Symmetry: C3
């Protein structure tokens, strides 16, 4: 397909620093070249320069609010620009707090978008329910219209305007959800397939139900926010918040191959890859290699094989 | 839920000695504290003191019959006492021979109980079909009423009285069954889901069929005897009789989450954890960590998340 | 069952040399003894002596054509001889190019045979579509009647005569298919279950559909060509062309147990085991151990257990 690459070297949504190198190690893995090797029209919009915000004391428990809020604001603008150029935005990011800007900018051009959130976490804590204070665990709360009223005026996010409803999002891969987050899940009736649902139904039925749920009424642009920790740490160990018993490499590729086949992928986020957290150089390459594989599947690379519209014999 | 913890530091049902440290490493992993962290009312009935039986020569091929028989007799009494206190018995054990006492004592208070046996083995050898002579591979034969007549008078087990019928037990995870055991399986018509059935149907259908099979006619108390070697050794390596191709971490949690949701868990055994068999300190923690996780799922810990009956917003 | 073992220490269908030791390490693993331990009548037809062909320059891009062609010709004759003796041929091989001779000889005695190809690759490149020039990636093209006309006269294969039609073969495990191969797949309407189909349907449904597809109309002899790289490299690392995200140990045993139960297994190939490629001695034993396990399942070894037709009690 036609892609718009945008690097988001940002880490202030969480504690560990190596995540801001995500764009770097992914590009170094040959991601752009691999994409072009497929039927892909690629345009690199570069790495966003996230100016340093020295004065950024916590808002209550919430850490680096101004830095996070600004980074998302800048990203929102870049994503909308790539979308206005008629390209699928591909955000190579640092931490998941960037989802606020990615989905926000995406929704500016396509308000009817539907979101698929692949993650071990729901990232739906509010600045008031969070216990860690890390903003990468709160992006969804800022985007949901139903939660508008339970979100205090956190410095750096006055530009935010909830752009999705509880029913325009589906979670896949959940296995470490905070109490307050679970309360929000059940209270708002959010659609989710935790690892339990995946075990019960199988990834095939999960995807069928996911896509039917979001595209049932009518077709709409899809936004895939992919947290690499959604996959089991045996595949993506170099990440800040790993949780055992995750989605397999295969399921990861299944999810993305199915999303690709819809022809509706509109926005994509490959988040939380932290090269500095690899216990070994191999754990780093294993994580980056899996992240690239998942990305390539989102744009057409199929396990059964691919061939050009010609007569090979 | 409401739990009654009882440690069973016993190993004479098999050759390797480290298994008697199971209660110790599990408690040290913070199992009691983790349980209390959930909606659990926990009461530790302590570790059973299994007096030394110096004179215990083999009965034919059967090893340490008096020691094994006595340990189960003592455990049977403790389990019945915890059951009479209105608590779910949680036996942190050594080897699986202890199942004879656990199920026996449990059945004294709840004769209508149904058993789910998660294991790589059927543990249904009789003292006459066993080839190893290890009693942890024969517990089920002593408990089945239909096999009463094929069980010689083994020193130490005169107190035993078969308490379950062939149709009150379901096996999950089988992958190393002895010939005589398979003969008993097919002859008595015992319900089982070997790894082959799990591969064929998926763990979801397996659990649906398991619970429908045991609770179809009417609801009854459930006894879960969980041998950690039922799970693949990539998850629980520190165990005496590991067999490759086992149940995954995920399936292990699925089985237990589903049992929990029935609200009928009445007795639980977490067996065969042998810290001394870990090739590395990490293999030990990996095994103990998985054992704790499985235990927590049996008492409510759900992957989709948990929340108190309050308004979190 | 009744087996006819034939060693095929051959490697010239690909670059890496250790694969010709496959027969050796498998026999050393006790394969013959293990088979006899089951209800198996085993006869070792020995290791085929593949005479050295010093003058064998490439045919265009195609490497070692005369050596490969001769090795398959010799193997075809041996397989037909074992089949005429009323035995299931078990080819312990080197590289997969040997499939040309195995299926060829098998089809001489049983022209109505159906093939199940477990592999990460389709091995259907023609001498003209191949980009590697390695013949182990082209065996199927030489056997398919529909491709007769697109196969140049390659030195060493004048003895070949396509013996199977597009609809007498089913692929399972595909995850690295070349463009030209995919073109052939879709153009000839070949039945396949890539890793994507396995993820979608589950290995149970895959096997049901595979066997129904090949045995629907009427029962016929089955030929299983098993490339060990079909299974994930976490199980069979010592192989020349490994690809991540493969079939699990369990699925491997499921496939073969189901094939065994048909009672129609007529020919079997255990290919691509290369002891020299093991990064460690354990990776070598892990690969050989998995290969033996898969082989034993093909001849009756069931995970639920096995028992002789006698009264064990
Ligand atoms: N629920 C935890 C973990 C969040 C991880 C963030 N992520 O999934 O990108 C928190 O609120 O800090
Ligand atoms: N079937 C073997 C292995 C038993 C292992 C015991 N277990 O599963 O707890 C025997 O009878 O010795
Ligand atoms: N498709 C590649 C890989 C073939 C591997 C051969 N195999 O699967 O036995 C080629 O044509 O060289
Ligand atoms: Mn996460
Ligand atoms: Mn996340
Ligand atoms: Mn066991
Ligand atoms: Mn056991
Ligand atoms: Mn292959
Ligand atoms: Mn092959």
């Amino acid at each position: 397909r036609t892609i718009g690459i945008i690097g988001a070297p940002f880490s202030k949504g969480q504690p560990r620093g190596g995540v801001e190198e995500g764009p770097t190690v992914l590009r170094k893995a040959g991601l752009l070249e691999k994409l072009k090797e497929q039927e892909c029209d690629v345009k690199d919009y570069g790495d966003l320069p996230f100016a340093d915000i020295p004065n950024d004391s916590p808002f209550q428990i919430v850490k680096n609010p101004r830095s996070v809020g600004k980074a998302s604001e800048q990203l929102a603008g870049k994503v909308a620009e790539v979308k206005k150029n008629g390209r699928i935005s591909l955000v190579l990011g640092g931490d998941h707090s960037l989802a606020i800007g990615s989905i926000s900018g995406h929704a500016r051009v396509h308000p009817d978008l539907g979101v698929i959130w692949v993650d071990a976490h729901t990232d739906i804590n509010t600045p008031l329910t969070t216990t860690s204070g890390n903003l990468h665990g709160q992006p969804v709360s800022f985007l949901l219209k139903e939660l508008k009223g339970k979100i205090p005026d956190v410095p750096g996010f006055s530009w935010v305007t909830p752009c999705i409803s509880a029913k325009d999002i589906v979670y896949i891969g959940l296995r470490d959800v905070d109490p307050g987050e679970h309360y929000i899940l059940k209270t708002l009736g959010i659609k989710y397939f935790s690892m339990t649902e995946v075990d019960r139904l199988g990834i095939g039925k999960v995807m069928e139900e996911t896509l039917s749920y979001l595209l049932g009424r009518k077709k709409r642009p899809i936004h895939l926010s992919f947290d690499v920790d959604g996959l089991d740490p045996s595949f993506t160990p170099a990440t800040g918040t790993p949780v055992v018993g995750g989605l397999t490499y295969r399921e990861g590729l299944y999810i993305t191959e199915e999303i690709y086949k819809t022809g509706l992928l509109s926005g994509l986020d490959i988040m939380e890859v932290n090269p500095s957290l690899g216990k070994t150089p191999e754990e780093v390459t294993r994580t980056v290699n899996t992240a690239v594989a998942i990305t390539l599947a989102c744009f057409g690379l199929a396990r059964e094989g691919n061939h050009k519209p010609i007569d090979y014999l």
